[PDB]
Design a protein around this ligand. Structure first.
Ligand SMILES: [Ca+2]
Ligand SMILES: [Ca+2]
Ligand SMILES: [Ca+2]
Length: 208
């Protein structure tokens, strides 16, 4: 019978400037490598350095997003625990250097399900764009500063809307279906004014 075996994580360590936040994903797995539903606790072992929170208040799922807030320069660890299992994830909070490059981050699964009845509902993609210094530290969230667009004229039957959603000083770019007739990839272009920063492909699926 399946038991929790691994608290899988998509980060080997968080690197963030003071005053910035960064995210990573947890996936609970059984001994066979399949998803396992269980609850999780997240704790910072030095809250004066960094604080931490977890999506869905850490209940009822096999996948969670952990958010780390850089409070003051220093190093610490995030401990993620479920039952007898734990993972300690390194955290480094730095002053932060000048911007070296950008990361286009997909917060969800990167998919929009144009089915009328999927459960759980899966009707968007959520994007952030980060500024990153030469050492790989997140030094800014520039999601509000960028413009994200798809092709002006549809050429593949996949049609999406992209809209900035801003509250309490935090911006997410939210992608939704806009009358897609087909499934497939749609290329989004990310620009800072007239400068192209990169592209990201979102996917429309249909699980009906
Ligand atoms: Ca999605
Ligand atoms: Ca749907
Ligand atoms: Ca299209």
């Amino acid at each position: 019978n399946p038991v929790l075996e691994t608290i899988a994580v998509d980060s080997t360590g968080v690197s963030v400037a003071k005053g910035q936040k960064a995210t990573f994903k947890v996936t609970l797995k059984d001994q066979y490598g399949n998803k396992f539903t269980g609850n999780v606790n997240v704790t910072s072992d030095k809250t004066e350095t960094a604080t931490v929170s977890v999506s869905n208040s850490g209940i009822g799922q096999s996948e969670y997003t952990v958010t780390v807030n850089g409070v003051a320069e220093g190093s610490t660890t995030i401990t993620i625990k479920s039952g007898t299992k734990e993972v300690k994830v390194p955290v480094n909070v730095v002053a932060g250097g000048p911007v070296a490059n950008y990361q286009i981050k997909v917060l969800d699964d990167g998919k929009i399900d144009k089915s009328a009845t999927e459960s759980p509902a899966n009707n968007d993609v959520q994007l952030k764009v980060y500024a990153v210094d030469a050492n790989g530290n997140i030094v800014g969230d520039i999601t509000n500063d960028v413009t994200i667009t798809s092709e002006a004229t549809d050429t593949n039957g996949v049609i999406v809307n992209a809209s900035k959603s801003t509250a309490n000083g935090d911006t997410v770019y939210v992608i939704t279906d806009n009358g897609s007739k087909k499934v497939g990839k749609e290329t989004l272009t990310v620009k800072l004014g007239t400068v192209t920063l990169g592209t990201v492909d979102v996917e429309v699926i249909d699980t009906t």
